[PDB]
């Protein structure tokens, strides 16, 4: 049984400031972390395979404990879902973090 939860299930930070969404996971050996941004009707890929996508590469860095932004904007207010799958897909974890930019 693997564990994947978040310490800060709901962040609220002022515009143009740095912020880290923490996804702390345990119980994996060969895990693949993946984050997806959610702004209502649209989903966007932020990070996949412990690697940040191109559309974000310039202002979001990865870490096994969460992704952190160089600076945020209202544009990024939404529900970020962090998914951690093991190798083989027999171990799966997931947790959503809610971001609110001001």
């Amino acid at each position: 049984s693997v564990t994947v939860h978040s310490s800060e299930p709901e962040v609220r930070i002022p515009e143009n400031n740095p912020v880290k969404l923490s996804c702390a996971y345990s119980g994996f050996s060969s895990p693949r972390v993946e984050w997806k941004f959610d702004q209502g009707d649209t989903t966007r890929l932020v990070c996949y395979n412990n690697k940040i996508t191109a559309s974000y590469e310039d202002r979001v860095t990865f870490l096994p404990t969460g992704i952190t932004f160089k600076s945020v904007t209202r544009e990024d207010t939404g529900t970020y879902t962090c998914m951690v799958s093991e190798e083989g897909g027999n171990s799966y974890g997931e947790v959503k973090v809610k971001l609110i930019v001001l």
Binding site: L45, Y48, N49, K51, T53, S85, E87, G88, G89
Partner: protein
């Protein structure tokens, strides 16, 4: 076993090969989108997905579409439509996001203006995978004027990232 690294794992006691590595079946119900020379349109589709060893196969069923340019791009949006436990990241090629001409194959498409379809032999291949969106190049085979296009069932494969 503690000293075994996937795909090598414990099978019926003995050191064996993980079945999940050998065969892993899934599905994608997403959006395929054509584009090129200003022509744009999308279609919702249900395709099976098989992961055999280090390859990944996407069995696109046949589907219908609209006008298409001589040179175009067909994009599968894997950001959504995948079946848990599958992750969009799992659809990433071994050659990551470089631009390639992998799996080049011939594929016939029927083009019509409502009435009877005339089939064109076009060239298609895996061009590049970026941010969960697989883009296949579809060109060649000459062209004629039309408003509708009928596509065949195509299975797309390529080395999968690990």
């Amino acid at each position: 076993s503690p000293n075994l690294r996937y795909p090598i794992a414990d099978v019926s006691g003995g050191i064996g090969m993980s079945p999940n590595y050998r065969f892993r079946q899934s599905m994608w119900i997403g959006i395929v989108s054509y584009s090129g020379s200003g022509l744009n349109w999308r279609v919702q589709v249900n395709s099976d997905i098989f992961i055999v060893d280090d390859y990944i196969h996407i069995c696109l069923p046949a589907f219908d579409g609209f006008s298409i340019a001589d040179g175009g791009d067909l994009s599968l949006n894997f950001v959504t439509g995948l079946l848990p436990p599958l992750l969009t990241g799992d659809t990433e090629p071994a050659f990551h996001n470089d631009v390639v001409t992998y799996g080049a194959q011939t594929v016939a498409i029927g083009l019509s203006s409502g009435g009877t379809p005339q089939y064109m032999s076009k060239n298609l291949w895996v061009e590049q995978w970026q941010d969960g969106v697989l883009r296949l190049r579809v060109e060649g085979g000459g062209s004629i004027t039309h408003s509708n296009s009928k596509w065949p069932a195509m299975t797309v494969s390529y080395p999968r990232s690990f």
